Design an enzyme around this catalytic site. Sequence first.
Site, PDB file in Angstrom:
ATOM      1  N   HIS A   1      -7.260  -5.602  -1.449  1.00  0.00           N
ATOM      2  CA  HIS A   1      -6.293  -4.902  -0.668  1.00  0.00           C
ATOM      3  C   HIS A   1      -5.824  -5.610   0.609  1.00  0.00           C
ATOM      4  O   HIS A   1      -4.692  -5.668   0.853  1.00  0.00           O
ATOM      5  CB  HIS A   1      -6.803  -3.534  -0.348  1.00  0.00           C
TER       6      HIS A   1
ATOM      7  N   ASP B   1      -7.348 -10.347   5.322  1.00  0.00           N
ATOM      8  CA  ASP B   1      -8.604 -10.827   4.939  1.00  0.00           C
ATOM      9  C   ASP B   1      -8.410 -12.202   4.311  1.00  0.00           C
ATOM     10  O   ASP B   1      -7.578 -12.400   3.476  1.00  0.00           O
ATOM     11  CB  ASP B   1      -9.355  -9.877   4.034  1.00  0.00           C
TER      12      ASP B   1
ATOM     13  N   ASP C   1      -9.144  -2.436  -5.855  1.00  0.00           N
ATOM     14  CA  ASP C   1      -8.968  -3.600  -4.996  1.00  0.00           C
ATOM     15  C   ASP C   1      -9.687  -3.414  -3.663  1.00  0.00           C
ATOM     16  O   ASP C   1      -9.391  -4.100  -2.686  1.00  0.00           O
ATOM     17  CB  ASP C   1      -7.482  -3.872  -4.757  1.00  0.00           C
TER      18      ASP C   1
ATOM     19  N   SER D   1       0.794  -1.184   0.000  1.00  0.00           N
ATOM     20  CA  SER D   1       0.000   0.000   0.000  1.00  0.00           C
ATOM     21  C   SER D   1       0.832   1.240   0.000  1.00  0.00           C
ATOM     22  O   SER D   1       1.667   1.373  -0.783  1.00  0.00           O
ATOM     23  CB  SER D   1      -0.988  -0.065   1.131  1.00  0.00           C
TER      24      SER D   1
HETATM   25 CA    CA Z   1     -11.876 -12.566   1.118  1.00  0.00          CA
END
Ligand code: CA
Length: 392
Positions: A356, A363, A315, A111
């Site tokens: 992202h 995640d 994203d 990022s």
């Molecule tokens: Ca996911």
Amino acid sequence: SRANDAPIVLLHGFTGWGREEMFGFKYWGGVRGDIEQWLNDNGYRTYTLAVGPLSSNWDRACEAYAQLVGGTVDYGAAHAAKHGHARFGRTYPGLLPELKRGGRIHIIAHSQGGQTARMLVSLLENGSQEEREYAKAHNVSLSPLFEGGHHFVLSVTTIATPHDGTTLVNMVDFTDRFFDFQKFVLKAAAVASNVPYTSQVYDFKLDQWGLRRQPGESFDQYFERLKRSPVWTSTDTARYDLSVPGAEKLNQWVKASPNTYYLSFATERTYRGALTGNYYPELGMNAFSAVVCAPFLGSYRNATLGIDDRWLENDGIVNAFSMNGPKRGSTDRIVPYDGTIKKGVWNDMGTYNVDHLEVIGVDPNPLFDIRAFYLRLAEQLASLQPHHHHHH
Ligand SMILES: [Ca+2]
Ligand SMILES: [Zn+2]
């Protein structure tokens, strides 16, 4: 195979923390594990940087340098006087003392860390003319970081970096949502935002500004105070550097070193709507992004700011178009990977289907083999040749 021995150094964006922070829940790995550990176990020496998430790229860099070589963070006299913060910061023991002895490193950045990594390379190589001049006109001391001549970085790799900014900052309510994003990340690590934890948990490292979470105060309460502070209202901020205009200014001076390799990785977790031209969040996108950010990023246009159809694919946090390299107000060249890693240019390694937050494991994404991604990346980094003899 192995051509260099340089260690790897990991670097975050506008969210991030130390390995000891967030009860051991890693930024680099998240729910999938520990990326640094994975690389070490596989024999790729790796470390981790933790700088101020909401701070300007300039501050981070000054922090990174110091955290790398050891010492007291020096934000530069001209810079500190300009933005009204302290010149001196937090002291560090130094992750890699070998750097002062001739050694080099590979930076992997996610990022906003990408912007920081680029700046750091620039400062290491060229220093700051402004700082040198100031030092001489006011007879003040100067940090080495501003004198130029440092050759520490063999390579820079960016992943989901907003090289040309992200249109996210343009949301009418960006302020509240950006802080809701921090809250979501906290949650991801099983940490509450409404609880006044006594333990540090998430140090935003705002020493320069005199800011810190106080006792009896939850994250929710601390974010209300951050919102009104100079780290959110000044130009010396991640908030500014994050914007399209901010990214372009930074690109006006942060150039690619002809002695360093640059790698770019793009991300997208969207689909295009046939009747509208807009981009929508895919299945599996982190909840927050999907409800709050994605729709905005995939639909927001501004012709006066040059934001057009190519900017929609995102994203969940950053526009994909911005990831391959700085372009707006830049002189940097960007070359498509053709099987050969070239020096002093952005080698555009393509676009990967993950959001992202999935790219770093914050995640979950069972279809993405995270370990394999980072390992393949470490192998390519190790094969990098310092010297390239010009041939047929
Ligand atoms: Ca996911
Ligand atoms: Zn600053």
